[PDB]
């Protein structure tokens, strides 16, 4: 009586980023990355869902969401990489760290993790020209750790 119809990306991400989680839910996290490739609508939906979660005022929700993003960048391939490397997504991270937007009430832990991940991708995936541009802009505008 196990359900054949695929679990939704919404159901999956809500479990992977649930503020009640006592520790990282790796099964749900790995499951979400594994499933977002399953259709055309998948990877853009996944990035929209992640962007919302990352903007949470509840620190543990946002930190879990960033851990999903980190993990999916490792396990997933091109369609997901292409969605993350658009300003459609990158702008949502910018809004989290910028004082113009949400930055003044975002947790330092969340802001620092965003800067780490962006920096990591500049070195690990140098082809992604818009990730490089966004990161260069954040430095130019004086967005730094702590």
């Amino acid at each position: 009586e196990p359900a054949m119809e695929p679990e939704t990306l919404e159901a999956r991400i809500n479990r992977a980023t649930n503020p009640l989680n006592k520790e990282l839910d790796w099964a749900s996290i790995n499951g979400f990355c594994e499933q977002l490739n399953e259709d055309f609508e998948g990877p853009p939906l996944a990035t929209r869902l992640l962007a919302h979660k990352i903007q949470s005022p509840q620190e543990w929700e946002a930190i879990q969401a960033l851990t999903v993003l980190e993990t999916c960048m490792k396990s997933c391939g091109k369609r997901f990489h292409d969605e993350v490397g658009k300003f459609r997504f990158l702008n949502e991270l910018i809004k989290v760290v910028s004082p113009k937007y949400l930055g003044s009430r975002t947790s330092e832990k969340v802001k620092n993790k965003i800067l780490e991940l962006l920096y990591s991708w500049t070195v690990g995936l140098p082809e992604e020209v818009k990730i490089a541009e966004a990161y260069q802009m954040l430095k130019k505008q004086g967005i730094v750790k702590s």
């Binding site: 300003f87 990158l90 910028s98 113009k100 541009e133």
Partner: peptide, 11 residues
Amino acid sequence: GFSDDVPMVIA
């Protein structure tokens, strides 16, 4: 032709 993206938001 046309971008499927949007302009970068400035921090």
